[PDB]
Design an enzyme around this catalytic site. Structure first.
Site, PDB file in Angstrom:
ATOM      1  N   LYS A 118       0.790  -1.092   0.174  1.00 16.81           N
ATOM      2  CA  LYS A 118      -0.094   0.161  -0.121  1.00 16.81           C
ATOM      3  C   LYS A 118       0.998   1.197  -0.022  1.00 16.81           C
ATOM      4  O   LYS A 118       0.361   2.196  -0.479  1.00 16.81           O
ATOM      5  CB  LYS A 118      -1.030   0.012   1.237  1.00 16.81           C
ATOM      6  CG  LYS A 118      -1.852  -1.323   1.287  1.00 16.81           C
ATOM      7  CD  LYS A 118      -2.766  -0.940   2.522  1.00 16.81           C
ATOM      8  CE  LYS A 118      -2.547  -2.564   3.295  1.00 16.81           C
ATOM      9  NZ  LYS A 118      -1.328  -2.403   3.974  1.00 16.81           N
ATOM     10  N   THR A 119       1.918   1.223   0.718  1.00  9.00           N
ATOM     11  CA  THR A 119       2.769   2.459   0.634  1.00  9.00           C
ATOM     12  C   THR A 119       3.618   2.527  -0.508  1.00  9.00           C
ATOM     13  O   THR A 119       4.000   3.633  -1.066  1.00  9.00           O
ATOM     14  CB  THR A 119       3.803   2.512   1.965  1.00  9.00           C
ATOM     15  OG1 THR A 119       2.861   2.380   3.170  1.00  9.00           O
ATOM     16  CG2 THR A 119       4.746   3.687   1.954  1.00  9.00           C
TER      17      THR A 119
ATOM     18  N   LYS B 125       4.927  -8.908  -0.427  1.00  6.37           N
ATOM     19  CA  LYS B 125       6.018  -8.629   0.651  1.00  6.37           C
ATOM     20  C   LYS B 125       6.477  -9.902   1.188  1.00  6.37           C
ATOM     21  O   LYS B 125       7.438 -10.531   1.423  1.00  6.37           O
ATOM     22  CB  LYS B 125       5.537  -7.563   1.780  1.00  6.37           C
ATOM     23  CG  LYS B 125       6.705  -7.325   2.695  1.00  6.37           C
ATOM     24  CD  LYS B 125       6.236  -6.212   3.661  1.00  6.37           C
ATOM     25  CE  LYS B 125       7.342  -5.524   4.293  1.00  6.37           C
ATOM     26  NZ  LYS B 125       6.933  -4.572   5.595  1.00  6.37           N
TER      27      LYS B 125
ATOM     28  N   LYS C  82     -10.930  19.015   5.856  1.00  8.06           N
ATOM     29  CA  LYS C  82     -12.003  19.792   5.106  1.00  8.06           C
ATOM     30  C   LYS C  82     -11.727  21.469   5.298  1.00  8.06           C
ATOM     31  O   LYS C  82     -12.672  22.331   5.182  1.00  8.06           O
ATOM     32  CB  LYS C  82     -13.273  19.579   6.071  1.00  8.06           C
ATOM     33  CG  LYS C  82     -13.998  18.414   5.980  1.00  8.06           C
ATOM     34  CD  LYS C  82     -14.385  17.988   7.159  1.00  8.06           C
ATOM     35  CE  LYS C  82     -15.464  18.908   7.733  1.00  8.06           C
ATOM     36  NZ  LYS C  82     -16.055  18.504   9.045  1.00  8.06           N
TER      37      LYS C  82
ATOM     38  N   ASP D 223       0.436   8.001   6.193  1.00  9.45           N
ATOM     39  CA  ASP D 223       0.674   6.741   6.212  1.00  9.45           C
ATOM     40  C   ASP D 223       0.404   5.963   7.357  1.00  9.45           C
ATOM     41  O   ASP D 223       0.665   6.434   8.538  1.00  9.45           O
ATOM     42  CB  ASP D 223       2.365   6.652   6.141  1.00  9.45           C
ATOM     43  CG  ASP D 223       2.605   5.505   5.217  1.00  9.45           C
ATOM     44  OD1 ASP D 223       2.015   4.631   4.850  1.00  9.45           O
ATOM     45  OD2 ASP D 223       3.887   5.448   4.560  1.00  9.45           O
ATOM     46  N   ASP D 224      -0.194   4.586   7.331  1.00 12.13           N
ATOM     47  CA  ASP D 224      -0.564   3.810   8.502  1.00 12.13           C
ATOM     48  C   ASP D 224      -1.208   4.559   9.561  1.00 12.13           C
ATOM     49  O   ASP D 224      -0.588   4.621  10.640  1.00 12.13           O
ATOM     50  CB  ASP D 224       0.797   3.125   8.813  1.00 12.13           C
ATOM     51  CG  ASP D 224       0.555   1.755   9.480  1.00 12.13           C
ATOM     52  OD1 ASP D 224       1.299   1.292  10.110  1.00 12.13           O
ATOM     53  OD2 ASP D 224      -0.143   1.047   8.515  1.00 12.13           O
TER      54      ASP D 224
HETATM   55  N1  LIG Z   1       3.867  -4.826  -7.443  1.00 14.64           N
HETATM   56  C1  LIG Z   1       4.438  -4.180  -6.263  1.00 14.64           C
HETATM   57  N2  LIG Z   1       3.347  -3.418  -5.373  1.00 14.64           N
HETATM   58  C2  LIG Z   1       3.577  -3.150  -4.370  1.00 14.64           C
HETATM   59  N3  LIG Z   1       4.976  -3.277  -3.870  1.00 14.64           N
HETATM   60  C3  LIG Z   1       5.736  -4.030  -4.514  1.00 14.64           C
HETATM   61  C4  LIG Z   1       5.416  -4.602  -5.860  1.00 14.64           C
HETATM   62  N4  LIG Z   1       6.676  -5.301  -6.271  1.00 14.64           N
HETATM   63  C5  LIG Z   1       7.476  -4.970  -5.247  1.00 14.64           C
HETATM   64  N5  LIG Z   1       6.813  -4.513  -4.397  1.00 14.64           N
HETATM   65  C6  LIG Z   1       7.876  -3.886  -3.085  1.00 14.64           C
HETATM   66  O1  LIG Z   1       7.200  -4.873  -2.149  1.00 14.64           O
HETATM   67  C7  LIG Z   1       7.159  -3.971  -0.919  1.00 14.64           C
HETATM   68  C8  LIG Z   1       5.897  -3.705  -0.538  1.00 14.64           C
HETATM   69  O2  LIG Z   1       5.618  -3.635   0.960  1.00 14.64           O
HETATM   70  P1  LIG Z   1       5.068  -2.214   1.659  1.00 14.64           P
HETATM   71  O3  LIG Z   1       5.982  -1.395   2.165  1.00 14.64           O
HETATM   72  O4  LIG Z   1       4.018  -1.409   0.632  1.00 14.64           O
HETATM   73  O5  LIG Z   1       4.340  -2.840   2.894  1.00 14.64           O
HETATM   74  P2  LIG Z   1       2.847  -2.610   3.626  1.00 14.64           P
HETATM   75  O6  LIG Z   1       1.792  -2.908   2.692  1.00 14.64           O
HETATM   76  O7  LIG Z   1       2.604  -1.152   3.981  1.00 14.64           O
HETATM   77  O8  LIG Z   1       3.053  -3.487   4.821  1.00 14.64           O
HETATM   78  P3  LIG Z   1       2.322  -3.375   6.388  1.00 14.64           P
HETATM   79  O9  LIG Z   1       1.307  -4.473   6.454  1.00 14.64           O
HETATM   80  O10 LIG Z   1       3.510  -3.676   7.339  1.00 14.64           O
HETATM   81  O11 LIG Z   1       1.783  -1.985   6.439  1.00 14.64           O
HETATM   82  C9  LIG Z   1       8.062  -2.929  -1.043  1.00 14.64           C
HETATM   83  O12 LIG Z   1       9.436  -3.197  -0.938  1.00 14.64           O
HETATM   84  C10 LIG Z   1       7.653  -2.738  -2.453  1.00 14.64           C
HETATM   85  O13 LIG Z   1       9.076  -2.390  -3.392  1.00 14.64           O
END
Ligand SMILES: Nc1ncnc2c1ncn2[C@@H]1O[C@H](COP(=O)(O)OP(=O)(O)OP(=O)(O)O)[C@@H](O)[C@H]1O
Ligand SMILES: Nc1ncnc2c1ncn2[C@@H]1O[C@H](COP(=O)(O)OP(=O)(O)OP(=O)(O)O)[C@@H](O)[C@H]1O
Ligand SMILES: Nc1ncnc2c1ncn2[C@@H]1O[C@H](COP(=O)(O)OP(=O)(O)OP(=O)(O)O)[C@@H](O)[C@H]1O
Ligand SMILES: Nc1ncnc2c1ncn2[C@@H]1O[C@H](COP(=O)(O)OP(=O)(O)OP(=O)(O)O)[C@@H](O)[C@H]1O
Lengths: 529, 37, 427
Positions: free
Chosen positions: A338-339, A497, A420, A392-393
């Site tokens: 998501k981030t 991830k 708003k 974020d988060d």
């Molecule tokens: N198609 C993709 N979409 C998203 N992330 C990707 C993709 N391909 C590789 N990645 C990598 O996967 C990781 C995504 O993890 P991310 O930082 O978004 O965690 P998160 O979803 O926020 O997790 P948490 O549950 O801890 O909140 C990053 O390293 C991103 O670079």
């Protein structure tokens, strides 16, 4: 013999035009007309803004364009003294010449400039510390009663510079006192071009600048740079050009045979941009290198859908005019990416100002400090023609825990009020936000503030899993043919991830004991869609 | 840390030494005027 | 007569090269060319880093390299005073000579140097609302107005040192003001070799050093040492060697028999390295003797499996590049030996940095103190190319009790945020 081009100030045409119109327009007209109207003259100017945008330069130049006396400068709190009744004497000593030459020469005298520097250090609000600090309640009164009192003066002019225009006294800003209030803000492209021309004119007169350096590229490639940063960039490029000849390996020796071919090439400018200068109201390539750690790979259809929706939102916020504030919420299951997608969507907007408000940098703060940090970031975001901000988060930003439940109320109220609040008229803002628990946010009535929602899905088919493995490129040849045989005949539910983590954990076994452990790990995690 | 204070001052006329005694040189001038006469 | 070889600084080639290029490059070029450009000079330097890595040394050498006047020195907060407007007088008294000489001579004046020591004790964020403040506001405003005001000075250079670079004001760090920022950190193997060669050049000159010692070995056996400890090691070895030649300990005199044969051998180096010096970014072998009180006994099969799993995780966290951060949880019933196994897994990893964060050193602390202690340990861990941190008795940290339940939310949030924060790049 005054000529504007000689002043050497760029990006401030309108401000100077207004200053000239209001302050020096009734002193450069034939005296008979100015006397028949029966108007007095303005007695002050105030200048405020962020640091580095060219205030003191303007005052210094205004001090040299007048055929008048030598201006008197006061450097900060240069008047305070320890004895009783000496600060007021120091303040009264500044107007003595003006009062003496007004009482003799009548209406034929000349200006007496006075320049206060950092005026907010000795002119704060009255009655603010139980009668003030003892010496900050008589200084203010003396200044008020000497600028404009019972005895009349008509041949002075006071200029003030400040960084925090909210702490100044209110009675000191009425139209009979410091009256002309201006703001010195960041320049736009056509201001940066003029600044660069001003600071590069001298070099290009003696053939010290190599034909190959194009100023349009520099103007375009430096977004939200102040004047000071542009000057520093040019200076760093010149220093790099100079240092090629000097040698300091054993003893300093200046080569004098190559010194006749000095020329500043564009490589110096690029290196100085990359390594030396960091702006303050811009963006760099470090946040994105810290959040998008492994790039982005297209393993299926939804990935493109999310980006297309983000692009539509960005276009709407950039073009339309009825709605200058749009927000969106990205939600999905944990370990889903998501981030990374939020950062990718933000980085490909080409907005000048881009920030990321994250809980990584508020470890141990109370809730008041969190409110202050959020407020400061959003205050910074209101001084640009286009802004994007990312939250974020969220669930970690409220201290949510299922037991109880427990959380912070001040931060929640600040967030609910800050979604708003439209910006100053004419400017546009975009807010993105990421969370992994939509139902909880719904329970707090926080899904009405957001305008739209987007869903980030998991991997849910064998073909997508195999495509992701192919893109990453870890298991190849016969190994692949095994996995295809085992996984296609079932369903999967796993995040990207966690997939990276599982592959890395599996790659630690023996060369002939990898696929089996990988399959065991993939099965043990459990899907439970 | 409370601080930032002030004070008052006084003086003293320390040049008490007399000077009138050595300024009464008129009589010597009178005597020498008589001599010149 | 200046030459870099006599400065006596090792492991800081790149930092000095950058400082020389940016600061002094335009004061040594022919003046006609510099006049045909119209560029002003740089006006400051800021040095920050952990304690003991060579900040004050660099400033002293810079001060006594140039042909400038003898530099001024401000030893901490020695300008403050209790009367009204007495701090600003001391702030203004520093820049008087530069102003006078600039007014008199013009563009032929020499250089003036001012050295601020522990600059975070004076310059702090000014503030936004009419609260707190103090003498800091006035002092900072005066300093800002003096460095860069309506009168232009072109013949000064200001140097600042600090350990906490996150407190200093922002308006004091823009280009034009102190705009050169450098970080001094722990050295690598070549740095330790250079330092050890610098600090034992005299002894080798007079044949006072034995033939057994090999510096390339001490450059390998000392990991995560800073300069101030690579000096103390040699000093302790020398002291041991000298004390070996005093048989009149109860009295005070010298045998004057074998002093002609005074020499420093490898045994002194090893003894001093093993007894006296205790690094602060390294592993110390006292914890493992306080947490493993009876050693590990192989009473069955599971012990080997647990140790093998730990070994595999340790191997993974050192060779992989996609995952620079790993975690693992050891859990079981009460009275089963979890802390001992965690300590034994940590000891057999040969990581240069190892530390343990236990709750028996936090008796009586409130929430914020615990948060600060944990944050400090992790901050220290973020300054080594490898690391390993152990967090034991998680439930005692949260202050958990079934009646209720009751616990601390702030510590829980701090831990949950620290568990997934990657270190700087490469570590
Ligand atoms: N198609 C993709 N979409 C998203 N992330 C990707 C993709 N391909 C590789 N990645 C990598 O996967 C990781 C995504 O993890 P991310 O930082 O978004 O965690 P998160 O979803 O926020 O997790 P948490 O549950 O801890 O909140 C990053 O390293 C991103 O670079
Ligand atoms: N419009 C401009 N044109 C040319 N140079 C400029 C301009 N604006 C700023 N500068 C450069 O900025 C420097 C002067 O900055 P100045 O003294 O005005 O700072 P300030 O922001 O008013 O002060 P402070 O932030 O420290 O309170 C000089 O390098 C001047 O060249
Ligand atoms: N790079 C180095 N090369 C050689 N010797 C060094 C080096 N760094 C430190 N030393 C030795 O260690 C001593 C450390 O003293 P120094 O004043 O440099 O420490 P510091 O880190 O600036 O101080 P503090 O941490 O108290 O602010 C130096 O005097 C010198 O003896
Ligand atoms: N094979 C073994 N595994 C673990 N501990 C062992 C073993 N053999 C001997 N011991 C000793 O048994 C003791 C185990 O106590 P320890 O403090 O490790 O328990 P614990 O699991 O942390 O307890 P608690 O449930 O009270 O937190 C230590 O002295 C350890 O040296």
């Amino acid at each position: 013999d005054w000529n504007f081009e000689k002043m050497g100030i760029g990006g401030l045409d309108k401000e100077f035009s207004d200053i000239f119109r209001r302050a020096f327009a009734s002193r450069v007209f034939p005296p008979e007309i100015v006397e028949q109207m029966g108007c007095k003259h303005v007695k002050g100017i105030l200048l405020y803004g962020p640091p580095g945008c060219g205030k003191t330069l303007l005052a210094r130049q205004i001090g040299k364009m007048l055929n008048a006396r030598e201006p008197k400068v006061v450097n900060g709190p240069e008047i305070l003294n320890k004895y009783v009744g000496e600060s007021e004497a120091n303040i009264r000593k500044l107007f003595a010449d003006a009062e003496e030459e007004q009482r003799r020469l009548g209406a034929n005298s000349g200006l007496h400039i006075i320049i206060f520097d950092e005026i907010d250090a000795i002119c704060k609000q009255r009655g603010s510390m139980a009668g003030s600090t003892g010496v900050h309640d008589t200084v203010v009164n003396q200044l008020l009663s000497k600028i404009d009192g019972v005895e009349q003066l008509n041949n002075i002019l006071v200029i003030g510079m400040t960084n925090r225009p909210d702490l100044i006294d209110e009675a000191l800003l009425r139209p009979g006192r410091l009256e002309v209030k201006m703001e010195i803000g960041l320049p736009d492209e056509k201001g940066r071009l003029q600044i660069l021309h001003i600071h590069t004119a001298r070099m290009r007169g003696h053939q010290l600048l190599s034909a190959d350096v194009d100023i349009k590229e520099l103007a375009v490639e430096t977004k939200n740079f102040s004047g000071a940063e542009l000057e520093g960039l040019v200076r760093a490029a010149q220093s790099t050009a100079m240092n090629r000849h000097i040698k300091a390996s054993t003893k300093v020796e200046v080569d004098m045979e190559k010194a006749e071919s000095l020329q500043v090439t564009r490589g110096d400018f690029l290196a100085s941009l990359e390594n030396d200068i960091k702006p303050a109201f811009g963006t760099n390539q470090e946040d994105y290198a810290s959040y998008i750690m492994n790039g982005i790979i297209k393993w299926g259809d939804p990935v493109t859908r999310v980006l297309d929706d983000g692009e539509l939102l960005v276009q709407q916020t950039k073009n339309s005019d009825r709605t200058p504030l749009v927000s969106v919420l990205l939600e999905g299951p944990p370990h889903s990416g998501k981030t990374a997608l939020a950062a990718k969507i933000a980085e490909e907007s080409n907005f000048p100002f881009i920030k990321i408000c994250s809980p990584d940098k508020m470890i141990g703060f109370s809730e008041t400090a969190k409110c202050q940090a959020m407020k400061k970031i959003f205050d910074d975001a209101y001084k640009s023609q286009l802004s994007c901000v990312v939250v974020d988060d969220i669930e970690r930003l409220l201290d949510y825990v299922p037991i109880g439940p427990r959380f912070s109320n001040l931060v929640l109220q600040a967030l609910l009020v800050l979604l708003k609040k439209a910006p100053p008229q004419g400017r546009k803002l975009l807010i993105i936000g990421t969370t992994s628990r939509k139902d909880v946010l719904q329970e707090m009535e926080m899904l009405n503030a957001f305008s739209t929602t987007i869903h980030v899905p998991n991997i849910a088919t064998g073909e997508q899993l195999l495509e992701a493995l192919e893109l990453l490129g870890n298991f190849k040849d016969k190994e692949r043919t095994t996995i295809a045989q085992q996984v296609k005949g079932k369903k999967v539910w796993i995040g990207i991830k966690k997939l990276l983590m599982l592959i890395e954990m599996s790659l630690q076994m023996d060369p002939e004991y990898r696929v089996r452990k990988f399959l065991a790990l993939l099965r043990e995690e459990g899907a439970s869609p | 840390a409370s601080g930032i204070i002030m004070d008052s001052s006084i003086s003293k006329q320390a040049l008490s030494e007399i000077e009138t005694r050595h300024s009464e040189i008129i009589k010597l001038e009178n005597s020498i005027r008589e001599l010149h006469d």
